[PDB]
Amino acid sequence: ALTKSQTDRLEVLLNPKDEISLNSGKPFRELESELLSRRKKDLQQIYAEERENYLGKLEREITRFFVDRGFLEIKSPILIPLEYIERMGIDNDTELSKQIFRVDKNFCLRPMLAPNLANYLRKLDRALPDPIKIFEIGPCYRKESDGKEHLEEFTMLNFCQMGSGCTRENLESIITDFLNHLGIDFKIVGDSCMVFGDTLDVMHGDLELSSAVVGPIPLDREWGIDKPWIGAGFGLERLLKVKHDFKNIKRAARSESYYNGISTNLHHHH
Amino acid sequence: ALTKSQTDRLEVLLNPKDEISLNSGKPFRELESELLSRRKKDLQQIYAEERENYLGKLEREITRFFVDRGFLEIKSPILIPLEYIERMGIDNDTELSKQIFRVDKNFCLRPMLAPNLANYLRKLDRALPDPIKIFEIGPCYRKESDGKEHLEEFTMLNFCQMGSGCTRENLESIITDFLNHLGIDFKIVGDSCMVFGDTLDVMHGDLELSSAVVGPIPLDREWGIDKPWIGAGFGLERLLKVKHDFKNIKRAARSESYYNGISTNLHHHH
Numbered sequence: 423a424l425t426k427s428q429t430d431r432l433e434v435l436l437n438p439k440d441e442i443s444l445n446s447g448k449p450f451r452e453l454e455s456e457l458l459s460r461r462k463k464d465l466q467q468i469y470a471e472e473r474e475n476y477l478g479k480l481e482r483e484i485t486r487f488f489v490d491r492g493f494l495e496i497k498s499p500i501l502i503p504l505e506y507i508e509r510m511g512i513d514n515d516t517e518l519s520k521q522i523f524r525v526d527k528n529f530c531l532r533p534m535l536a537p538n539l540a541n542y543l544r545k546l547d548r549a550l551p552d553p554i555k556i557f558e559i560g561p562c563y564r565k566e567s568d569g570k571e572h573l574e575e576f577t578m579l580n581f582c583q584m585g586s587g588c589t590r591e592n593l594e595s596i597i598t599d600f601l602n603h604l605g606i607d608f609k610i611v612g613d614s615c616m617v618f619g620d621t622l623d624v625m626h627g628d629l630e631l632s633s634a635v636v637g638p639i640p641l642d643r644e645w646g647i648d649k650p651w652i653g654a655g656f657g658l659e660r661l662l663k664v665k666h667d668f669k670n671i672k673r674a675a676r677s678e679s680y681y682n683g684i685s686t687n688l689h690h691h692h
Numbered sequence: 693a694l695t696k697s698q699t700d701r702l703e704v705l706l707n708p709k710d711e712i713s714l715n716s717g718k719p720f721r722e723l724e725s726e727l728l729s730r731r732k733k734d735l736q737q738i739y740a741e742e743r744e745n746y747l748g749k750l751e752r753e754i755t756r757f758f759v760d761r762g763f764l765e766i767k768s769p770i771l772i773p774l775e776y777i778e779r780m781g782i783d784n785d786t787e788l789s790k791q792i793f794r795v796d797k798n799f800c801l802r803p804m805l806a807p808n809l810a811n812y813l814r815k816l817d818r819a820l821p822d823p824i825k826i827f828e829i830g831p832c833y834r835k836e837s838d839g840k841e842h843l844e845e846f847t848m849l850n851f852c853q854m855g856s857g858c859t860r861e862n863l864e865s866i867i868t869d870f871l872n873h874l875g876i877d878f879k880i881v882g883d884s885c886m887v888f889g890d891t892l893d894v895m896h897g898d899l900e901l902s903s904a905v906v907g908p909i910p911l912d913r914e915w916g917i918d919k920p921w922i923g924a925g926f927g928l929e930r931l932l933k934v935k936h937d938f939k940n941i942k943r944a945a946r947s948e949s950y951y952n953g954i955s956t957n958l959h960h961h962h
């Protein structure tokens with residue numbers, strides 16, 4: 423019989439495609455040696471052939487998709503003023519407020535892309551023709567209980583449009599074209615959150631890929647926005663989790679422990 | 693005569709290619725209106741044509757260069773254990789130690805990529821053939837006096853090789869092939885730093901593009917490295933500064949104030 427420590431170690435080395443059972447009586451060593459060989463060969467093939475990191479590669483694929491559809495690529499600060507949190511309507515006694523990583527006294531790691539993108543929409547409206555279409559991909563941060571679907575350090579895509587064409591129909595059509603491009607099935611369900619109000623959540627089974635919003639909303643005034651807008655935020659690690667059938671989202675994260683979902687800890691267990 | 697406030701505002705709107713003088717007596721308005729028109733047209737053309745962010749585009753170009761030359765693309769954590777700082781030989785009473793953004797009690801924003809990459813080298817050595825070649829591009833953080841050449845939030849490339857081929861000659865040859873690819877002239881000068889010891893600094897005039905190291909070094913033991921290695925770190929914003937002849941590195945940074953070196957603040961000054 424395998425101990426919990428042993429079972430945990432074999433789970434680390436097991437990949438979704440494997441058809442190997444941890445409950446069929448084989449000694450821990452036979453199982454560990456088999457899996458280590460498979461994972462070493464997996465890394466050897468990546469190194470010999472493509473050499474691209476899944477998170478980087480997905481960012482690049484997504485970037486191409488939105489640039490080709492007329493959206494401006496944004497790269498904004500990750501370390502942001504703490505004041506942006508308050509101004510997003512996140513009161514400091516709320517749950518999301520307790521998820522913020524504070525830095526020094528007056529800054530934080532951004533938990534979302536929206537405030538920076540709201541500032542870009544306002545500013546670009548002075549220069550660009552209608553409709554204004556922009557997107558950003560990059561790191562975001564939230565203190566979490568984690569579990570299998572949450573990370574403290576994750577990667578968000580947020581695209582948005584402001585001016586004409588900002589209807590629920592167009593928003594759903596963009597989401598549909600995007601997830602069709604990635605080859606991911608989904609449904610849309612109505613939900614709500616404290617910050618934006620009513621949302622359209624993009625679901626893969628019970629897993630939330632995205633929350634999306636059809637503006638305008640009352641918050642807009644605080645960011646100097648006064649036109650219709652639509653936008654959606656997606657977690658890249660969640661997209662990878664679905665695409666590669668990972669059981670735990672940690673396999674898709676920035677990590678020292680996994681590379682393209684393959685364990686980097688290829689020592690023997692004792 | 694222009695006030696300091698006026699001169700500063702016009703400097704924000706001026707771009708390197710402009711042949712417009714702020715010292716030839718024209719009223720502030722004539723100058724401000726001219727520059728605003730140029731910058732709006734610059735943004736309009738980016739939006740109509742390419743839509744790519746310089747920092748993102750450069751990351752993608754660099755990634756392709758190193759992947760095609762046999763280096764594995766790494767995406768590791770930005771938020772790292774504070775203990776990694778100590779173990780890099782950065783004592784807490786040193787100057788670099790005072791540049792660290794601490795997060796909670798036991799973490800920090802990484803000020804460099806090396807510790808994460810050292811862990812990857814050690815781990816991948818259990819799986820990959822000689823030589824092991826890896827690189828990472830991403831955000832790094834240092835409290836700075838700033839000025840025209842430093843940012844608190846910047847983007848580093850670090851490539852490294854471990855095993856065979858880890859000579860000064862090969863390191864210089866990679867650096868040369870890389871900067872030749874980017875179309876940037878440079879020289880190499882010997883320097884030294886507290887962490888790695890003797891370095892080879894890659895200079896464009898008086899501007900440091902990179903520090904590079906030929907190992908092994910005594911620090912290696914603390915990271916479980918015991919083979920020869922070579923590596924170099926480059927700032928992407930510094931590369932952009934040179935490529936686009938920016939006067940201030942802030943034009944190349946993740947920002948809400950500049951997009952591809954063009955001011956996003958296109959209001960009228962009073």
Ligand SMILES: Nc1ncnc2c1ncn2[C@@H]1O[C@H](COP(=O)(O)OC(=O)[C@@H](N)CCCC[NH2+]C(=O)OCCc2ccco2)[C@@H](O)[C@H]1O
Nearest residue numbers: 534536540572573576582631632633635653654655656657
């Ligand atoms: N902990 C953790 N780990 C992994 N993935 C995670 C995660 N937490 C979230 N995700 C993934 O991100 C997606 C979106 O997160 P969310 O909390 O549901 O939604 C928001 O953060 C929100 N900002 C998304 C965009 C809403 C539309 N708003 C917008 O476009 O604003 C644009 C500009 C503007 C105008 C006025 C105001 O702002 C999760 O679904 C998950 O995948």
Ligand SMILES: Nc1ncnc2c1ncn2[C@@H]1O[C@H](COP(=O)(O)OC(=O)[C@@H](N)CCCC[NH2+]C(=O)OCCc2ccco2)[C@@H](O)[C@H]1O
Nearest residue numbers: 804806810842843846852901902903905923924925926927
């Ligand atoms: N504040 C600020 N703003 C803009 N750009 C900045 C900046 N500070 C630095 N830069 C740019 O980064 C380049 C490198 O920074 P550095 O301090 O000179 O050098 C280092 O950080 C160092 N880690 C670079 C790599 C050295 C080689 N080491 C390595 O490859 O390790 C690999 C693994 C290993 C094995 C054993 C131990 O580790 C600046 O030149 C500037 O452009």
Ligand SMILES: [Mg+2]
Nearest residue numbers: 518564566572
């Ligand atoms: Mg949540």
Ligand SMILES: [Mg+2]
Nearest residue numbers: 623630632633
């Ligand atoms: Mg949601």
Ligand SMILES: [Mg+2]
Nearest residue numbers: 788834836842
């Ligand atoms: Mg320095």
Ligand SMILES: [Mg+2]
Nearest residue numbers: 893900902903
């Ligand atoms: Mg240096």
